[PDB]
Design an enzyme around this catalytic site. Structure first.
Site, PDB file in Angstrom:
ATOM      1  N   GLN A   1      12.655 -38.731 -20.950  1.00 17.26           N
ATOM      2  CA  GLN A   1      11.849 -38.083 -19.912  1.00 17.26           C
ATOM      3  C   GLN A   1      12.755 -37.374 -18.923  1.00 17.26           C
ATOM      4  O   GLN A   1      13.557 -38.038 -18.216  1.00 17.26           O
ATOM      5  CB  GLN A   1      10.888 -39.064 -19.252  1.00 17.26           C
TER       6      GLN A   1
ATOM      7  N   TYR B   1       6.313 -34.857  -8.521  1.00 20.95           N
ATOM      8  CA  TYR B   1       7.704 -34.345  -8.619  1.00 20.95           C
ATOM      9  C   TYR B   1       7.728 -32.825  -8.646  1.00 20.95           C
ATOM     10  O   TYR B   1       6.730 -32.158  -8.306  1.00 20.95           O
ATOM     11  CB  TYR B   1       8.454 -35.110  -9.718  1.00 20.95           C
TER      12      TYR B   1
ATOM     13  N   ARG C   1       2.974 -50.993 -17.469  1.00 21.31           N
ATOM     14  CA  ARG C   1       3.246 -52.364 -16.968  1.00 21.31           C
ATOM     15  C   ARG C   1       3.161 -53.408 -18.086  1.00 21.31           C
ATOM     16  O   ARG C   1       3.939 -54.353 -18.067  1.00 21.31           O
ATOM     17  CB  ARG C   1       2.273 -52.642 -15.824  1.00 21.31           C
TER      18      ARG C   1
HETATM   19  C1  LIG Z   1       7.835 -49.838 -12.347  1.00 21.89           C
HETATM   20  C2  LIG Z   1       7.221 -48.515 -12.723  1.00 21.89           C
HETATM   21  C3  LIG Z   1       8.003 -47.363 -12.958  1.00 21.89           C
HETATM   22  C4  LIG Z   1       7.484 -46.137 -13.394  1.00 21.89           C
HETATM   23  N1  LIG Z   1       8.327 -45.055 -13.577  1.00 21.89           N
HETATM   24  C5  LIG Z   1       7.800 -43.932 -14.037  1.00 21.89           C
HETATM   25  C6  LIG Z   1       8.655 -42.925 -14.550  1.00 21.89           C
HETATM   26  O1  LIG Z   1       9.904 -43.040 -14.600  1.00 21.89           O
HETATM   27  N2  LIG Z   1       8.047 -41.787 -15.001  1.00 21.89           N
HETATM   28  C7  LIG Z   1       6.684 -41.614 -15.008  1.00 21.89           C
HETATM   29  O2  LIG Z   1       6.213 -40.541 -15.480  1.00 21.89           O
HETATM   30  N3  LIG Z   1       5.872 -42.596 -14.641  1.00 21.89           N
HETATM   31  C8  LIG Z   1       6.398 -43.745 -14.195  1.00 21.89           C
HETATM   32  N4  LIG Z   1       5.524 -44.791 -13.914  1.00 21.89           N
HETATM   33  C9  LIG Z   1       4.134 -44.732 -14.210  1.00 21.89           C
HETATM   34  C10 LIG Z   1       3.866 -45.312 -15.609  1.00 21.89           C
HETATM   35  O3  LIG Z   1       4.415 -44.561 -16.691  1.00 21.89           O
HETATM   36  C11 LIG Z   1       2.378 -45.474 -15.882  1.00 21.89           C
HETATM   37  O4  LIG Z   1       1.777 -44.210 -15.712  1.00 21.89           O
HETATM   38  C12 LIG Z   1       1.709 -46.471 -14.955  1.00 21.89           C
HETATM   39  O5  LIG Z   1       2.416 -47.699 -14.941  1.00 21.89           O
HETATM   40  C13 LIG Z   1       0.251 -46.744 -15.335  1.00 21.89           C
HETATM   41  O6  LIG Z   1       0.052 -47.113 -16.686  1.00 21.89           O
HETATM   42  P1  LIG Z   1      -0.224 -48.670 -16.996  1.00 21.89           P
HETATM   43  O7  LIG Z   1      -1.608 -48.952 -16.432  1.00 21.89           O
HETATM   44  O8  LIG Z   1      -0.166 -48.735 -18.467  1.00 21.89           O
HETATM   45  O9  LIG Z   1       0.852 -49.481 -16.336  1.00 21.89           O
HETATM   46  C14 LIG Z   1       6.075 -45.990 -13.473  1.00 21.89           C
HETATM   47  C15 LIG Z   1       5.311 -47.113 -13.267  1.00 21.89           C
HETATM   48  C16 LIG Z   1       5.822 -48.333 -12.844  1.00 21.89           C
HETATM   49  C17 LIG Z   1       4.938 -49.560 -12.632  1.00 21.89           C
END
Ligand SMILES: Cc1cc2nc3c(=O)[nH]c(=O)nc-3n(C[C@H](O)[C@H](O)[C@H](O)COP(=O)(O)O)c2cc1C
Length: 356
Positions: free
Chosen positions: A98, A177, A316
């Protein structure tokens, strides 16, 4: 017809299943943004994902503010990513980098320079630094020499990802971003060919995508968008008028796959009443569409059965369930994730969540 367990092709990338590890910033690189050996273990533990999308990986020092996050502008960074990627491939996994420019979301104490953006705006709240949280700084509106430079940095980062052995890249065009700050009219107050009407607000995304495609191939290029809901102070007042055209441009340019992060009204990683645009985007972007946020196993299975998505990315759940695909296949409870160690520097809350 597809289930989460069925294989899928992301361009030439042959994924064994449709359970994608979403990109997750963890802050387990060094202060020089060089990946650390512990990251090899973390990604190898998660290689049963059909596709891993790395943590956001900075394309440049200007664009990388997050403490202890990695970059991929330098050969030192490339050489450190090589064994990380190799360890995933040796387990039969697939992994894409990414590519990150954080825009106004950086702090000058980290980058050494003013934050840059579409416009001279300030993100809400406080920003992570190596000396703790600080107020966000107003950015500067980039000019044509900056655009040329930033396009070069995306080009170089994409080349370097392939040099490191990645299967491809995902352009981070989401979550408030730099690219997102151009896309959305809440952040983009420009008067030039990059502001105003939707086609102008898409122009920066278009140029980044064109330069990445020319470097590495459209078939190795994916994108993440987050069309709906305020994320980090970035929102569009009428998202369908910019994000559906953006998705169509990506389809026409040959972009191999598209991920949408979509908060809902009861979302647990941000929430919004702005409607999800996946149903409209599904009709314009025809290659693999990956949806994300708040999916359970049954919601994900039903999405794929109803033709709403080709794959689902989980964030997560992959933090705490390195073997998420096996847990889903076997009806094993999903272990909770420790939010205190999302962004800390230890192996605690990182490589110490067991597999079933
Ligand atoms: C600890 C953490 C770090 C994340 N870092 C990024 C990242 O580097 N790039 C990004 O596009 N989204 C990032 N996200 C968002 C996740 O990719 C994802 O969209 C978000 O956790 C919701 O999906 P979920 O319900 O499956 O957790 C981050 C989320 C969390 C919790």
């Amino acid at each position: 017809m597809p289930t989460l367990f069925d294989p899928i092709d992301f361009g030439p990338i042959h994924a064994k299943n449709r359970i994608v590890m979403s990109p997750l910033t963890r802050g387990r690189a060094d202060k020089e943004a060089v990946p650390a050996p512990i990251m090899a273990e973390y990604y190898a533990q998660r290689a049963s994902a059909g596709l891993i999308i790395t943590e956001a990986t900075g394309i440049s020092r200007e664009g990388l503010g997050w403490p202890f996050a990695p970059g991929i502008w330098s050969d030192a960074q490339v050489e450190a990513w090589k064994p990380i990627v190799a360890g995933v491939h040796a387990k039969g996994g697939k992994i894409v980098c990414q590519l990150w420019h954080m825009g106004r979301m950086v702090h000058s104490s980290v980058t050494g320079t003013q934050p840059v953006s579409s416009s001279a705006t300030t993100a809400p709240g406080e920003v992570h630094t190596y000396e703790g949280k600080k107020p966000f700084e107003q950015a500067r509106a980039i000019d044509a020499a900056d655009i040329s430079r930033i396009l070069n940095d995306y080009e170089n980062a994409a080349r370097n990802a392939i040099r490191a052995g990645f299967d491809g890249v995902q352009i981070h065009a989401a979550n408030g971003y730099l690219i997102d700050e151009f896309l959305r009219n809440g952040t983009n107050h420009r008067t030039d060919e990059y502001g105003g009407v939707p086609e102008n607000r898409i122009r920066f995304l278009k140029e980044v995508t064109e330069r990445v495609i020319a470097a590495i191939g459209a078939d190795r290029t994916g994108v993440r968008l987050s069309p709906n809901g305020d994320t980090q102070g970035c929102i569009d007042s009428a998202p369908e008028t910019v994000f559906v055209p953006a998705a169509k441009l990506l389809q026409d340019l040959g972009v191999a796959w598209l991920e949408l992060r979509e908060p809902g009204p009861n979302g647990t990683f941000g929430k919004t009443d702005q409607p999800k645009l996946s149903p409209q985007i599904r009709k314009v972007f025809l290659r693999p569409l990956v949806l994300n946020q708040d999916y359970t196993f049954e919601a994900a299975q039903t999405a794929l059965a109803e033709g709403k998505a080709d794959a689902i990315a989980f964030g997560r759940k992959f933090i705490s369930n390195p073997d998420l695909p096996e847990r889903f296949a076997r009806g094993i409870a999903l272990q909770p994730d420790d939010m205190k160690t999302w962004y800390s520097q230890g192996p605690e809350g990182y490589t110490d969540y067991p597999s079933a």
